[PDB]
Design a protein around this ligand. Structure first.
Ligand SMILES: [Cl-]
Ligand SMILES: [Cl-]
Ligand SMILES: [K+]
Length: 164
């Protein structure tokens, strides 16, 4: 198991523009295209992303391409976040992956309300952070996925992703 496989399990793989759980235009492996309700706009974003005139459908390889970029950028931004880096730095590999996954999903803006949960992680108070993470819109709107992420934050093992 690793961040790519993990996120690959959580976001799936779709080669054609689709709407995510929030109803936004996305493609590939959870690659958000825009929060705009306009399909054209989404398609434009796609075109900008891939670097060609696609008409909403991409190849597997392309999809993977944007996914690599996505993971990398997420990590990179966590590292540029003064509030985030310390957290990340304090965690073991598995847990870090959970953190990247979370940010890949909700973004820094998203991660912004997790202050208290992040702190419990920092203090290595696993169970408490776990309870805390659950009290959030994030958990409420994507409870299955949240639950896995949370088990990883709590346990430090990939058990939750075993068998998926
Ligand atoms: Cl992009
Ligand atoms: Cl879910
Ligand atoms: K998805």
């Amino acid at each position: 198991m690793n961040i790519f496989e993990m996120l690959r399990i959580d976001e799936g793989l779709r080669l054609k523009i689709y709407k995510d759980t929030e109803g936004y235009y996305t493609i590939g492996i959870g690659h958000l295209l825009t929060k705009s309700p306009s399909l054209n706009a989404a398609k434009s974003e796609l075109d900008k992303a891939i670097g060609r005139n696609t008409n909403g459908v991409i190849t597997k390889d392309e999809a993977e391409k944007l996914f690599n970029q996505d993971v990398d950028a997420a990590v990179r931004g966590i590292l540029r976040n003064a509030k985030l880096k310390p957290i990340y730095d304090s965690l073991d590999a598995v847990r870090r992956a959970a953190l990247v996954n979370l940010i890949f999903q909700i973004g820094e803006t998203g991660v912004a309300g997790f202050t208290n949960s992040l702190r419990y992680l920092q203090q290595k108070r696993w169970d408490e952070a776990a309870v805390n993470f659950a009290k959030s819109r994030w958990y409420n709107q994507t409870p299955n996925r949240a639950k896995r992420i949370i088990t990883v934050f709590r346990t430090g093992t990939w058990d939750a992703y075993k068998n998926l």
